[PDB]
Design a protein around this ligand. Structure first.
Ligand SMILES: [Mg+2]
Ligand SMILES: [Mg+2]
Ligand SMILES: [Mg+2]
Ligand SMILES: [Mg+2]
Ligand SMILES: [Mg+2]
Ligand SMILES: [Mg+2]
Ligand SMILES: [Mg+2]
Ligand SMILES: [Mg+2]
Ligand SMILES: [Mg+2]
Ligand SMILES: [Mg+2]
Ligand SMILES: [Mg+2]
Ligand SMILES: [Mg+2]
Ligand SMILES: [Mg+2]
Ligand SMILES: [Mg+2]
Ligand SMILES: [Mg+2]
Length: 190
RNA sequence: CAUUGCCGCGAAGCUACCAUCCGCUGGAUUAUGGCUGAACGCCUCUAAGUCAGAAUCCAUGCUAGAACGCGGUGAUUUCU
């Protein structure tokens, strides 16, 4: 159809500074800073009143309009991550062999290492990405908490830890053993 | 001499899964599973973006070296 003008609102809270040179977005709030290259979308950012940023598509088809709300969600995730952060909580699900998840140093490269997953002799290793903080819960058993500003990094590192512990050659409606995301929320939220 | 007369052993050379030795590790992916995430206020692996991933592919490595692809370097002729 080629809609003439489609436009999304982006609400900036008070402690957040957003600098958008051409389509490279830098979001600087209290937790730190984040940058996203958006030069694959062809949208137009503008600033209204230092708390509101419009993003708009002009003469855009159905898919080009679809990518605009995606752009709004990406910049909102940047703002939410540098204001509140993200916190993904995973649980260890096992039947007989207790999954042993430790965090270890190998040449300064900060690995999560998983032992005894279904009684395996194979040590699994998931590198902690930059920004992601790993800690282990107290008073909640079998809980590993991945935290950070970047929801991309926290979610992908939690997904790496889930995919590294998938069951081979067994009925997986019965062999449920694994590490699973149980909670997605924020670092500092109430 | 017997068209290497025949028989035993026989160095050398050649040779045998009939003897030994040796046969590399990185990147990008397919299927598939995912992440973030709209379209479609929800959802969704997908549309933009993105992670992992096969005896695959491309490298590394191994063979040849364009006789019309190239480089560097040594010497370049008289009592002729
Ligand atoms: Mg599997
Ligand atoms: Mg079976
Ligand atoms: Mg005679
Ligand atoms: Mg005769
Ligand atoms: Mg004789
Ligand atoms: Mg005889
Ligand atoms: Mg031979
Ligand atoms: Mg090699
Ligand atoms: Mg895929
Ligand atoms: Mg996709
Ligand atoms: Mg895509
Ligand atoms: Mg994205
Ligand atoms: Mg990959
Ligand atoms: Mg030649
Ligand atoms: Mg020369």
């Amino acid at each position: 159809m080629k809609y003439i003008q489609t436009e999304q609102q982006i609400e900036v809270p008070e402690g957040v500074t957003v600098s958008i040179k051409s389509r490279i977005v830098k979001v600087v709030g209290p937790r730190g800073t984040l940058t996203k290259n958006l030069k694959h979308i062809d949208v137009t950012f503008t600033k209204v009143n230092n708390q509101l940023i419009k993003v708009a598509v002009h003469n855009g088809g159905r898919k080009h309009v679809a990518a605009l709300r995606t752009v709004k969600s990406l910049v909102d995730n940047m703002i939410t991550g540098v204001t509140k952060g993200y916190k993904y909580k995973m649980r260890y699900v096992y039947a007989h062999f207790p999954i042993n998840v430790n965090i270890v140093e190998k040449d300064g490269a900060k690995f999560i290492e998983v032992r005894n997953f279904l009684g395996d002799k194979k040590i699994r290793n998931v590198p902690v990405r930059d920004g992601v903080t790993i800690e282990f819960s107290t008073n909640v058993k079998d809980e590993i908490v991945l935290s950070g500003n970047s929801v991309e990094d926290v979610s992908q590192n939690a997904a790496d830890l889930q995919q590294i512990c998938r069951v081979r050659n067994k009925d997986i409606r019965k062999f449920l053993d694994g590490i699973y995301v149980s909670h997605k929320g924020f670092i500092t939220e109430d």
